[PDB]
């Protein structure tokens, strides 16, 4: 699956005048896919472990806490919870992503959660929470990689900046 356009939207929110090379975008897309699969897979195991037939934001949250190291997990849980509470309230919003306050695609995440046979059913809150987490991790990686680019007087993120950002961050290194 391609998340490149959403990675770009997030990049513009953290580093508005920094670009990303074709190879660096491909690496980001691979990161997003890998994390999606790992969280959805763990949510699936948790649903089965708890004899639930529906994946909801509860199983996504616990999956996220199991997979993500300390601080990343705290911030991810904060953003996923926020997205769900906003989505519940914001009935006059025009799209599911906008209802959640997100750049990442809530509808596509929902479709992929269903397509992956992670459980019999998927609740409306699950893709909101997961999309918010994917967006948060993307934003963190792009913040750091864009800082590396700037520190090297480059106007775009290239693969070596992603490597520096991820490998020199204890928690991202563990995650990725």
Swiss-Prot record:
Residues carrying sugar: 78
Major localization listed first in the record, in broad terms: nucleus
Annotated Gene Ontology cellular component terms: nucleosome; nucleus
KW Cytoplasm (keyword) present: no
PTM note: Monoubiquitination of Lys-86 by BRE1 gives a specific tag for epigenetic transcriptional activation and is also prerequisite for histone H3 'Lys-4' and 'Lys-79' methylation.
UniProt keyword terms in alphabetical order: Acetylation, Chromosome, DNA-binding, Glycoprotein, Isopeptide bond, Nucleosome core, Nucleus, Phosphoprotein, Ubl conjugation
Nucleus among keywords: yes
Cross-link (Glycyl lysine isopeptide (Lys-Gly) (interchain with G-Cter in ubiquitin)): 86
Top-level taxon in the UniProt lineage: Eukaryota
Record localization: Nucleus; Chromosome
An example Gene Ontology molecular-function term: structural constituent of chromatin
Quaternary data: The nucleosome is a histone octamer containing two molecules each of H2A, H2B, H3 and H4 assembled in one H3-H4 heterotetramer and two H2A-H2B heterodimers. The octamer wraps approximately 147 bp of DNA.
Family note: Belongs to the histone H2B family.
Function: Core component of nucleosome. Nucleosomes wrap and compact DNA into chromatin, limiting DNA accessibility to the cellular machineries which require DNA as a template. Histones thereby play a central role in transcription regulation, DNA repair, DNA replication and chromosomal stability. DNA accessibility is regulated via a complex set of post-translational modifications of histones, also called histone code, and nucleosome remodeling.
Protein name: Histone H2B 1.1
Source organism of this protein record: Xenopus laevis (African clawed frog)
């Amino acid at each position: 699956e391609s998340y490149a356009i959403y990675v770009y939207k997030v990049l513009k929110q953290v580093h508005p005048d920094t670009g990303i090379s074709s190879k660096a975008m491909s690496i980001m897309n691979s990161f997003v896919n890998d994390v999606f699969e790992r969280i959805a897979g763990e949510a699936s195991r948790l649903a089965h472990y708890n004899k639930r037939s529906t994946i909801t934001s509860r199983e996504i949250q616990t999956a996220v806490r199991l997979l993500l190291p300390g601080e990343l997990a705290k911030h991810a849980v904060s953003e996923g919870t926020k997205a769900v509470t906003k989505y519940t309230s914001a009935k006059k919003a025009k799209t599911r992503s906008s209802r959640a306050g997100l750049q990442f695609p809530v509808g596509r995440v929902h479709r992929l959660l269903r397509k992956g046979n992670y459980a019999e059913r998927v609740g409306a809150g699950a893709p909101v929470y997961l999309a918010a987490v994917l967006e948060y991790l993307t934003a963190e990686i792009l913040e750091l990689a864009g800082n590396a680019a700037r520190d090297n007087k480059k106007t775009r993120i290239i693969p070596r900046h992603l490597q520096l950002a991820v490998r020199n961050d204890e928690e991202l290194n563990k995650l990725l």
